Design an enzyme around this catalytic site. Structure first.
Site, mmCIF file in Angstrom:
data_model
loop_
_atom_site.group_PDB
_atom_site.id
_atom_site.type_symbol
_atom_site.label_atom_id
_atom_site.label_comp_id
_atom_site.label_asym_id
_atom_site.label_seq_id
_atom_site.Cartn_x
_atom_site.Cartn_y
_atom_site.Cartn_z
ATOM 1 N N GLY A 59 0.785 -1.209 0.000
ATOM 2 C CA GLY A 59 0.000 0.000 0.000
ATOM 3 C C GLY A 59 0.827 1.274 0.000
ATOM 4 N N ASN A 174 -4.165 -11.336 -1.898
ATOM 5 C CA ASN A 174 -4.768 -10.461 -0.932
ATOM 6 C C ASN A 174 -6.254 -10.689 -1.067
ATOM 7 O OD1 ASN A 174 -5.419 -8.495 0.701
ATOM 8 N ND2 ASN A 174 -5.146 -6.830 -0.662
ATOM 9 N N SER A 177 -8.617 -7.102 1.350
ATOM 10 C CA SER A 177 -8.882 -5.669 1.307
ATOM 11 C C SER A 177 -10.293 -5.354 1.801
ATOM 12 C CB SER A 177 -8.746 -5.096 -0.105
ATOM 13 O OG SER A 177 -9.397 -3.827 -0.122
ATOM 14 N N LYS A 207 -2.833 -13.256 2.299
ATOM 15 C CA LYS A 207 -2.942 -12.184 3.281
ATOM 16 C C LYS A 207 -4.375 -12.085 3.795
ATOM 17 C CE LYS A 207 -1.971 -7.235 4.231
ATOM 18 N NZ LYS A 207 -1.168 -6.084 3.667
ATOM 19 N N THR A 235 -1.879 -8.936 9.676
ATOM 20 C CA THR A 235 -3.129 -8.822 8.965
ATOM 21 C C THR A 235 -3.237 -7.559 8.104
ATOM 22 O OG1 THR A 235 -4.297 -7.472 10.620
ATOM 23 C CG2 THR A 235 -4.411 -9.861 10.952
HETATM 24 C C1 LIG Z 1 -3.081 3.940 2.938
HETATM 25 C C2 LIG Z 1 -3.047 2.388 2.995
HETATM 26 C C3 LIG Z 1 -3.172 1.659 1.825
HETATM 27 C C4 LIG Z 1 -3.113 0.240 1.808
HETATM 28 N N1 LIG Z 1 -3.213 -0.500 0.692
HETATM 29 C C5 LIG Z 1 -3.061 -1.819 0.770
HETATM 30 C C6 LIG Z 1 -2.931 -2.617 -0.491
HETATM 31 O O1 LIG Z 1 -2.997 -2.098 -1.747
HETATM 32 N N2 LIG Z 1 -2.734 -4.000 -0.429
HETATM 33 C C7 LIG Z 1 -2.655 -4.658 0.856
HETATM 34 O O2 LIG Z 1 -2.513 -6.004 0.902
HETATM 35 N N3 LIG Z 1 -2.789 -3.845 2.047
HETATM 36 C C8 LIG Z 1 -2.763 -2.511 1.932
HETATM 37 N N4 LIG Z 1 -2.811 -1.825 3.192
HETATM 38 C C9 LIG Z 1 -2.652 -2.534 4.469
HETATM 39 C C10 LIG Z 1 -1.196 -2.580 4.971
HETATM 40 O O3 LIG Z 1 -0.415 -3.370 4.098
HETATM 41 C C11 LIG Z 1 -1.252 -3.240 6.380
HETATM 42 O O4 LIG Z 1 -1.734 -4.579 6.276
HETATM 43 C C12 LIG Z 1 -2.123 -2.420 7.394
HETATM 44 O O5 LIG Z 1 -2.059 -1.037 7.208
HETATM 45 C C13 LIG Z 1 -1.621 -2.694 8.842
HETATM 46 O O6 LIG Z 1 -0.309 -2.258 8.991
HETATM 47 P P1 LIG Z 1 0.008 -0.825 9.707
HETATM 48 O O7 LIG Z 1 -0.839 -0.707 10.946
HETATM 49 O O8 LIG Z 1 1.439 -0.764 10.099
HETATM 50 O O9 LIG Z 1 -0.284 0.285 8.709
HETATM 51 C C14 LIG Z 1 -2.892 -0.380 3.040
HETATM 52 C C15 LIG Z 1 -2.753 0.379 4.211
HETATM 53 C C16 LIG Z 1 -2.845 1.739 4.182
HETATM 54 C C17 LIG Z 1 -2.701 2.495 5.527
HETATM 55 O O1 LIG Z 2 -8.271 0.493 -0.547
HETATM 56 C C1 LIG Z 2 -7.206 -0.147 -0.765
HETATM 57 O O2 LIG Z 2 -6.585 -0.070 -1.823
HETATM 58 C C2 LIG Z 2 -6.743 -1.112 0.303
HETATM 59 C C3 LIG Z 2 -6.790 -0.668 1.546
HETATM 60 C C4 LIG Z 2 -6.392 -1.539 2.657
HETATM 61 O O3 LIG Z 2 -6.441 -1.107 3.758
HETATM 62 N N1 LIG Z 2 -5.997 -2.845 2.348
HETATM 63 C C5 LIG Z 2 -5.977 -3.378 1.037
HETATM 64 O O4 LIG Z 2 -5.677 -4.524 0.829
HETATM 65 N N2 LIG Z 2 -6.343 -2.468 -0.067
#
Ligand SMILES: Cc1cc2nc3c(=O)[nH]c(=O)nc-3n(C[C@H](O)[C@H](O)[C@H](O)COP(=O)(O)O)c2cc1C
Ligand SMILES: O=C(O)c1cc(=O)[nH]c(=O)[nH]1
Ligand SMILES: Cc1c(C(=O)Nc2c(F)c(F)c(-c3ccccc3)c(F)c2F)c(O)nn1C
Ligand SMILES: [Cl-]
Ligand SMILES: [Cl-]
Ligand SMILES: [Cl-]
Length: 348
Positions: A59, A174, A177, A207, A235
């Site tokens: 992300g 994934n 989401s 994931k 997660t």
């Molecule tokens: C702005 C944002 C965008 C994200 N986009 C994705 C994504 O495209 N694919 C994914 O598997 N998780 C994505 N996540 C989740 C992160 O990979 C992670 O699993 C989640 O934020 C928990 O970690 P953290 O608390 O350290 O941010 C995104 C998270 C954030 C905050």
């Molecule tokens: O909106 C997304 O692209 C996104 C957000 C998130 O929190 N996790 C994910 O897998 N995709």
């Protein structure tokens, strides 16, 4: 440096720019290299060497624009994505929100993505540079998503395996989401992976959400063991809203990340490790902002950890902070290194 970013630079950037603008600027600076490991930290897992166990979570670099800058920041591995087969714009803006009082973020980007072909050419431009990095202990993961309008989810993931599998050390499916269906999907993914040439054949990980029922987690653990899936990422963000959130924006739709997610994630790691008898590597992620956060997840069963949201509050210095604090705690608790601490809570 850590106090300058945390108390002056980051809150001033937070005050001038909406969160998505700030993120794009961060990606740009990182990709340009404009930026401020002992043997104890090394981990061998997923068929690879990881010079340290702290990765950047999916992300942050959705499109593969900043990989080398992220290694320069100090991460032991980089995961890009999620990447969808076709380009797509994602949800309308604003679509991400800061909860400063909670050290939390809420996002509903909706898989905004440059799409597989663009990311393929981006990674090809540095493919041999990555092969040396990986050999040196700095592996690359690619997180695969699916287009909003797709009818056949498994075919979207299969496309991602064929196109970006050859450029990745591991792939992430994934399905999180914000049982036989999952078995069908993952059988197809693994068949596509196994059809790649051996030098271009990555590990495959699933994931998961922190919002699963106990039934869900049992079924995932069973399918993962039955099919020989290589690992789990535990997660993604939560669609729950824990009691106690103070941010004015806490009721925005989307996935919540940061400190309110931390222990929900750690407990999901703990359960999945026990349900897989400790035989399926786990990358632990959610609310890691310190060495203690990282070691709690490792002791609960993670072989590696990731973070993202902490980087948005504390800036680049947080990576070295987590690593330094983790090494110090490992010594204090008598571990010879990260490897000895993996799963340690389950042996008490
Ligand atoms: C702005 C944002 C965008 C994200 N986009 C994705 C994504 O495209 N694919 C994914 O598997 N998780 C994505 N996540 C989740 C992160 O990979 C992670 O699993 C989640 O934020 C928990 O970690 P953290 O608390 O350290 O941010 C995104 C998270 C954030 C905050
Ligand atoms: O909106 C997304 O692209 C996104 C957000 C998130 O929190 N996790 C994910 O897998 N995709
Ligand atoms: C995704 C995100 C950021 C974000 O990424 N901010 C951010 C960052 F994550 C950085 F890492 C830097 C930075 C600072 C110096 C050098 C290189 C990068 C930065 F400025 C930032 F705004 C933010 O403030 N809000 N949200 C939702
Ligand atoms: Cl848009
Ligand atoms: Cl905001
Ligand atoms: Cl190739």
């Amino acid at each position: 440096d850590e106090r300058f970013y945390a108390e002056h630079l980051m809150p001033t950037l937070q005050g001038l720019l909406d969160p998505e603008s700030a993120h794009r600027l961060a990606v740009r600076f990182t990709s340009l290299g404009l930026l401020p490991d002992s043997d104890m930290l090394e981990v061998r897992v997923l068929g690879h060497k990881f010079r340290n166990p702290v990765g950047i979570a999916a992300g942050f670099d959705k499109h593969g624009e900043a990989v080398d800058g992220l290694y320069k920041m100090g991460f032991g591995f980089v995961e890009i994505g999620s990447v969808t087969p076709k380009p797509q714009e994602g949800n309308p803006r604003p679509r991400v929100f800061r909860l400063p009082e909670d050290q939390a973020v809420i996002n509903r980007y909706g898989f905004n993505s440059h799409g597989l072909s663009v990311v393929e050419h981006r990674l090809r431009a540095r493919q041999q540079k990555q092969a040396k990095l990986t050999e040196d202990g700095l592996p690359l993961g690619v997180n695969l998503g699916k287009n909003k309008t797709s009818v056949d989810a498994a075919e979207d993931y299969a496309e991602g395996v064929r196109v970006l599998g050859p450029l990745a050390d591991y792939l992430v499916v994934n399905v999180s989401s914000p049982k036989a269906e999952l078995r069908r999907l993952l059988t197809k993914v693994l068949q596509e992976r196994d059809g790649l040439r051996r030098v271009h054949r990555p590990a495959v990980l699933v994931k998961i959400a922190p919002d699963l029922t106990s039934q869900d987690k049992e079924d995932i653990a069973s399918v993962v063991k039955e099919l020989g899936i290589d690992g789990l990422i535990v997660t993604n963000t939560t669609v729950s809203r824990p009691a106690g959130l103070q941010g004015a924006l806490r009721s925005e739709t989307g996935g919540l990340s940061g400190k309110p997610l931390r222990d929900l994630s750690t407990q999901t790691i703990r359960e999945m490790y026990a349900l897989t008898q400790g035989r399926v590597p786990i990358i632990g992620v959610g609310g890691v902002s310190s060495g203690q956060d990282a070691l709690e997840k490792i002791r609960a069963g993670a072989s590696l950890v990731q973070l993202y949201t902490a980087l948005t509050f504390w800036g680049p210095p947080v990576v070295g902070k987590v690593k330094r604090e983790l090494e110090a705690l490992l010594k204090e608790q008598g571990f010879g290194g990260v490897t000895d601490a993996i799963g340690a809570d389950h042996r008490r």
